[PDB]
Amino acid sequence: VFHKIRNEDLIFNESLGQGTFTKIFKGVRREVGDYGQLHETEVLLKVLDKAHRNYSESFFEAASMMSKLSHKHLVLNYGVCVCGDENILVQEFVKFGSLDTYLKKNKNCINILWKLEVAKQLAAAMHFLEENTLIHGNVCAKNILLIREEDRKTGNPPFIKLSDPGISITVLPKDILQERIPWVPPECIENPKNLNLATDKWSFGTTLWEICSGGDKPLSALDSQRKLQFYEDRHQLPAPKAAELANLINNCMDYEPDHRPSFRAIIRDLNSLF
Numbered sequence: 233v234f235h236k237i238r239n240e241d242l243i244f245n246e247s248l249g250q251g252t253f254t255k256i257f258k259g260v261r262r263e264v265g266d267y268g269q270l271h272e273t274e275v276l277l278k279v280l281d282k283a284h285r286n287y288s289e290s291f292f293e294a295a296s297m298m299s300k301l302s303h304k305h306l307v308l309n310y311g312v313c314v315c316g317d318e319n320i321l322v323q324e325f326v327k328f329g330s331l332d333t334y335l336k337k338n339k340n341c342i343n344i345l346w347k348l349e350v351a352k353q354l355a356a357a358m359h360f361l362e363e364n365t366l367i368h369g370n371v372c373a374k375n376i377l378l379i380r381e382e383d384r385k386t387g388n389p390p391f392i393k394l395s396d397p398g399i400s401i402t403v404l405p406k407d408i409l410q411e412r413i414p415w416v417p418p419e420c421i422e423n424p425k426n427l428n429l430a431t432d433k434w435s436f437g438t439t440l441w442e443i444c445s446g447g448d449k450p451l452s453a454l455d456s457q458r459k460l461q462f463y464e465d466r467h468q469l470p471a472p473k474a475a476e477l478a479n480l481i482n483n484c485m486d487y488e489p490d491h492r493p494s495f496r497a498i499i500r501d502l503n504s505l506f
């Protein structure tokens with residue numbers, strides 16, 4: 233149950249792009265904060281396309297269930313604006329944006345320790361979700377937000393958060409699902425209702441591949457028909473050039489969902505690289 237924010241208290245600024253049936257804007261929220269102090273707070277605004285209003289339930293159910301669990305590695309949702317014909321998610325604005333964009337622009341200055349630290353943090357967030365038996369369902373580098381850059385001057389590591397999952401793959405059209413191979417697992421291509429905790433272990437593997445690959449998209453050279461055939465022939469992703477996490481990636485991207493390792497075991501493996 234989300235706090236309702238008045239349209240009057242939001243200003244829309246620049247477009248930040250679009251997601252699946254959504255438009256993204258940087259914005260500002262006027263609000264009374266602690267001690268009654270007035271604030272104008274930078275916010276991330278996620279607007280459901282007016283033409284796809286039928287998706288609003290899934291749009292908001294995702295963000296809602298995760299926002300019931302507070303955690304340092306999970307994005308903060310302030311509330312929702314449902315004034316007028318709008319369906320707007322009002323979210324904390326993370327200073328350095330999405331991880332995939334960040335990896336591409338910083339490819340030639342991100343070392344293995346940075347990748348391992350970000351992987352550990354992501355695994356911590358997924359461990360927390362697994363303990364709470366809560367499925368994310370759309371783990372990917374675009375849904376990882378970089379709160380803070382690494383600072384070698386103080387040894388401060390980077391700090392990331394996992395964003396909301398957006399519209400569930402259980403209600404999206406099959407062609408969007410096919411294009412999201414290989415983040416969407418084989419069993420969910422076979423049947424979207426196979427969405428399960430084991431889904432998030434597979435997509436975590438794909439996300440590690442992104443992190444280790446300077447933001448390349450795995451299988452981007454394959455069209456949708458060939459992505460399906462990739463799964464039909466039981467292929468695995470190539471090892472990234474920085475190959476240190478390749479075995480972990482493949483262990484997570486196991487075609488047998490019951491064989492995919494728990495996030496506790498994943499965390500132990502990450503720690504053993506040191």
Ligand SMILES: Nc1nc(Oc2ccc(NC(=O)N[C@@H](CCc3ccccc3)C(=O)O)cc2)c2cc[nH]c2n1
Nearest residue numbers: 251252256276324325326329330372374375398412415
């Ligand atoms: N909290 C927040 N936020 C931001 O900006 C985002 C907007 C949207 C998203 N999240 C998505 O864009 N999610 C996609 C996923 C699509 C997908 C998933 C798996 C495989 C293929 C494709 C979607 O829903 O379409 C992430 C960051 C920014 C940008 C600067 N600062 C920010 N702070």
